[PDB]
């Protein structure tokens, strides 16, 4: 069987081709102790990865090796891949081909380093690197649609028509889940709550995933939150302290549609999707309007599909049928797509084997790369 | 039964001899993908022909193998004939004789290549190549008349008297439907509408076929369009956008009567018909005036028969009876004529069989050729 | 009943003996197609005769089998006789005796070929060949007179006295209707009108028969035409074009009296008649002067009898009574005479039967031949 | 000195009497701009004449004021005469008598308009209009011969004997160089070459003058061209494109001997010359056979004298000596003859002066007119 | 003196007629603050134009009022014209006539709005709107040539012959400098460089103008860049960071010759120029080949003239002399031409005065408009 590994900026999803869900989903973090050990006989490791770093985060500094979809620390990336293969999946990487994923418009050194590490450090027999938007389209059983994938690092709108990608129409919004976490940390100071460490950043991400939602009309929701108090929710911190948040619940996700809240000049995700559709030929825009596919963890806010539908309907001509496809499993769509791709009989010929890599080099790794 | 195939520059009309209408009418286009395919398992063919190329035109480059009645790409012409025989008519070309059509004054290599392809690629038992104007005269049940056939590539005026052709009086105007489509594309830029790709050219051809008409008096119509706004019509693009056109509606067909709008030096279709009549003997001009037969898709503009009548009446002596015959089925007249010709008992002896072609060669294909 | 057939260079007049007018009068022409037929199922014959050749003359080359009274094409002459017997009179030539006509001083091979064709091709029971001038004298009920017969091919003056012909006084002027048609074609170029084809020659003959007349005094008429414009007439061509002719109207017939207009050296018809009278014995000239009989289509110009009277009065002694007999039916006089001759009880013994022709041969055909 | 101006349908030849060659030979064309001028300060004239119209023909519509020897536009004819006098010869027309030329059997309004324009627009002191065939006979130093002059507009056969013209034997064939140019344009479409504009007509005329020739035996030459490829020649178009022509080289001039190629009913130039000789008296035919003089630019095809000799020898009795006189300067024979005529002391009394024209009018201009 | 204002999509060039260079050349941008001002007493304007917007671009959003040659914001266009007249030229627009420029095939509402604004907002006495290609031809001292003008918005090929425009042969390529800037931004992400804001777009345009060049052979240059490292150049960002670019230097301008790099279907600038030449009459193509004039800032890449020469030589017949005219001042050619045009004595009559505009309206503004 083949291994499917979706490495995002925030979470790593690993599993076996043919399955319907990732077997191992864990934070893509490396934690290192920031205090001196004083007790003899303690199994104090030098670093912690994933959930073990998340459970000991009180005495650790946590670092993401991937930032804005770009690997900034390849040693920590190798640590995370080692943890994936040996601790999470508990398999030998030299026995299975590995399907990895990457975002469009990424540096070529990224894919080249991934291939070099997979072939020289883990000694995988075969290997492939697929584009995440194409996999998200595989997961929904479509060959036409514009995929809006927003994870932890970056957001991308990729239009595909009848299996053909339109790379000139691909748009990138450098704003995703981690920026929303930082913005929530910033606006929680207005209520006197102070989160500053990396562990507190993990706490704020938990708050965001539990309590934040997308308002259908932002100004009406602001007026509602200012008038009464029915939007206030409570959250218990790990030390038993209880915080209460009101309009922040919908002010954090609103930065997805108004990036000026983050001091950014770019347009929201709705205008990004619309502009990506408008860069395509006039004859495919109608099919793209009816197949707008949401993907990633940042699209999991309650009410984001309705808000997206409303905004794109406001931007598009009135005769177009705007249809936002937001499946309940869209947090794993990429991985699911990868699974579907790695189980196709037609795909079993596109693996880059180790012999081809030894005889050609890093130039052969760019297969269906856009 | 015999197969009747009218191959024009724009449309292919195919059917069986004895029928009253073509069974398969489709655009004479070949579409090829201009983007890279990124999805595995998609039935991405190398090329598309006819309506399948028209439905996928968003990701295709469209090419006409025939330009100005001249085949510029014989491989694409064979693709179109294959699509005609196997996908549209769904017959075996080695079982039926084939009646093909050609315009007068065409290169002889055209007919020779057509015969070679029909006898060596499709292995047709018998084959004939008829002149399109004679077929258009068959369709109207006449033996005397001047046929003005204007399709997509070229316009021809062919006078025939009592079944005798006057080849010295045949006139050719290198201006037809595709030139009018290009001119409409050009003059739509005056309103800020930009159509540049081949798919947008198909869109503009649709606009032309739906909204354009021939003004009886051009300057009066221009004054009317400049004064009020009752001539303005709206058209919805495939992406839901709505464009509005005014005088363009009658400025595009006006190039048929004033080719100087296209930068051409030739005379209009009315003066071409009149000059073709005036090259004939004085004793047949009266019968030619009363039997001016319009044929082809470019004669399907509303008001072209009345304008033609008015112009030729202005050119001819006042005692002559100008009568423009414009049947409602004149878009298929050629094909209909071919049908009538291929069902005649007197014609069943004019088929060029494969034995005659093998024993003689390309010299035998010129039968009743003018 | 007997058949009377007057074969002239221009017209064939056929009918039954005893009638007062020819039943079938048609042009003595054979038309052959000069273009290629392109339509299947058309009744395109190989040749056309008479009025059917005249109606289709736009696509035909027209040929007269008789030129200057001499048959130049005996196959076309047989075609014309076949058309006469089967299409015009609609009789069986093997049931009726045939009275044919010939001009005086004609080659003997002409009469011999006529007899051979009538007896071997049409199998007529009896046959006779009469002289046209004697028949013209029969038509006027006279036995004395000088007949001036001018048809399409040749003009002849034949004096007859008390039923006796004076063959030594017979004069021939090789100038008749067809020469006048050619001269009218030539002088119409002075006004910019161009007639060149055989069909246009038929048009010019129609113009001549409708508009030309004989001026009583030629120089006075020329001065009148040069001064004012009251002599100008208009004529509508078959294609609706209108031409205007002035002095040509009387310049074309003037060549009958001044053959030098045609580059001919001979004398006019008046001097020819006078010289023919002066070759006769002095005792019969007075009776010849009073019985000058005009005959043929070329004597049908308005004012030719008055001009003839004036000229012959100027040539003859002042005591002679010049009387020009010009009956209104003199275009058919020959035929009428033939009718009268074929209904005489005294003539029913002069028929050359087929038995006499088989037992004697071509030598018996010269009966009353001069 | 006197001015000699030969105005043909195609070329104007102007010079001074006494010279041996025309000083100014230029195309008889008027060119008018068919596009709008967009640059300020350009010397954009309203019309161009002659070689200046030929050099700017890319942006001009070219018109011949003379068509088939008939002036269809007298304003353009005056433009051409003005260009002749002031730009080409650079003389004052009010100081020299002018000898003009005309074809036989031309409308009288032509000569009258020429005289009116020469006396009222250019104020010439004296003026004469000579027949072109008589001048061509002057150029060869003969008083007996049949001149076959074929230029751009019309062909004429004029027999002259001992200085006497036989106007009744003059024949006109409405087929010359321009018809051959149009026929070459038509038959070049069989090889896919398309020439349609007036500038392209000038290009085709250049092709005809460079590459066309008369085949001695037409069917043998057709067989030779069909078998091998030694008759193929190449020609470089003004834009650098190279066309190749084969049998067309001798199929275009063959229309001079087989006018049915042009859909014409008339006989070839050989049969026209023979028929013109046969209309003359029997005593001068022997001298006419030995003095057949070719004249004009259309007689400049290589091999036309030999073909003419062969055809007329086939038509004439075997005891006659057929001699075709084709001098190498026969393109200018008319002009040369005019020069010789305008330098004769006996001719200095035949000038029509302006006083005679004022006292008599247009009636005096017909001097030796036939 | 007259004012000459060349308003392009990217730069505005303003000056006085008679000068040899524009006095004021500044970016055609309007910048608006995207942050809130917090300091009292700061001269914080509402908007910035030109160089003042370029110097403060760190806190501004920059907008081009012209996009693809089409004015999308007329208020910002008026702001730019006001900045031109009062801040750059420092003149009163009500004292000088203004010569403006426009691209061919532009919407008529563009010229009408320009005239309305110049006559009602700035109250100019006279005004004219010239075509930019004609001005570029004025600047080179020619009346014949095909101008290929590529600026920031659109590329146009306009052939002119002897001062006559051939509007039917004008071609438009919707691809110019701004598309190349966007493509450079896109391909700089392959090296990990991220430029997303409008200020960063200005930075990338600076990089393009400093480091990009046209490779003579693209594949050989790609092989050279892949092998060694001699093509790598460095560029210092405004914050002191240094980026290094290699093949991008010639991959960005290569989109001018291979628009498929941008996902466009159109042909390159070389094929566009060749097709524009081939739409002209055959007689002017030779002069157009020798006078191909480059114009605009997008033609300022090193090596574009040699590449253009090579490509057009490959497309044209081998006997043609391809000559690319690329003067060193071709970035201002249009303006220079305008200067030359506004100083001509012949032009001082083509100004549209305010009285004519008040008495006629927007219909009079179309003078020499094509
Ligand atoms: N229910 C939820 N609501 C809002 N955001 C969520 C939810 N679940 C996950 N996220 C956010 O999704 C982001 C990463 O999700 P994922 O699609 O795995 O991204 P990546 O592929 O970059 O790892 C995180 O920033 C996380 O905060
Ligand atoms: N209703 C219509 N009005 C105007 N033009 C039409 C109409 N229908 C078809 N056409 C034009 O007719 C042209 C081709 O018609 P057709 O006679 O099939 O030509 P061909 O024989 O060359 O294929 C096309 O350019 C199309 O735009
Ligand atoms: N009304 C008329 N006026 C002048 N000529 C006429 C008239 N009718 C007939 N003709 C001429 O008479 C000629 C032939 O008449 P016809 O006596 O039948 O001759 P033929 O006996 O040779 O056939 C024709 O050339 C025709 O032009
Ligand atoms: N060398 C040549 N071969 C064939 N045709 C020629 C040649 N030179 C000239 N011509 C033809 O001669 C014609 C006109 O010649 P010219 O005698 O000047 O006629 P015109 O007197 O009517 O001007 C033109 O149509 C031209 O094509
Ligand atoms: N040296 C250079 N090399 C390449 N491109 C240049 C250079 N200088 C200017 N440009 C480009 O030219 C474009 C605009 O130039 P210009 O001719 O002024 O256009 P416009 O007339 O539309 O303002 C800009 O996109 C700019 O990037
Ligand atoms: Mg992801
Ligand atoms: Mg057709
Ligand atoms: Mg008779
Ligand atoms: Mg001549
Ligand atoms: Mg510009």
Residue numbers in the entry:
A (entry chain A), B (entry chain C), C (entry chain E), D (entry chain D), E (entry chain B): 6 to 375
How does the study describe this entry?
The release of inorganic phosphate (Pi) from actin filaments constitutes a key step in their regulated turnover, which is fundamental to many cellular functions.
For the first pathway, we introduced the p.N111S substitution to potentially disrupt the hydrogen bonding network of the R177-N111 backdoor. To structurally understand the differences in Pi-release rates between the R183W and N111S mutants, we determined the filament-core structures of these variants in the Mg2+-ADP-bound state at ~2.3-Å by cryo-EM. Instead, S111 forms a hydrogen bond with E107, the backbone of A108, and a water molecule within its local environment in the Pro-rich loop. Additionally, the density for the side chain of R177 is fragmented, indicating that the residue is more flexible than in wild-type F-actin structures. As a result, the interaction between the sensor loop and Pro-rich loop is disrupted and a ~4-Å-diameter hole is observed, yielding an open backdoor. Hence, the conformation of F-actin-N111S subunits is reminiscent of the arrangement of the ultimate subunit of the barbed-end structure. Accordingly, we identified that H161 adopts a mixture of rotameric states and that it partially adopts a G-actin-like conformation. Thus, although the backbone atom shifts in actin-N111S are minor when compared with those in wild-type actin (< 1 Å), side chain rearrangements result in a broken hydrogen bonding network and an open backdoor, defining the structural basis for the ultrafast Pi-release kinetics of F-actin-N111S. However, when estimating the release rate conservatively, actin-N111S releases Pi at a rate of ≥0.1 s−1, which is ≥15-fold faster than the rate of wild-type actin.
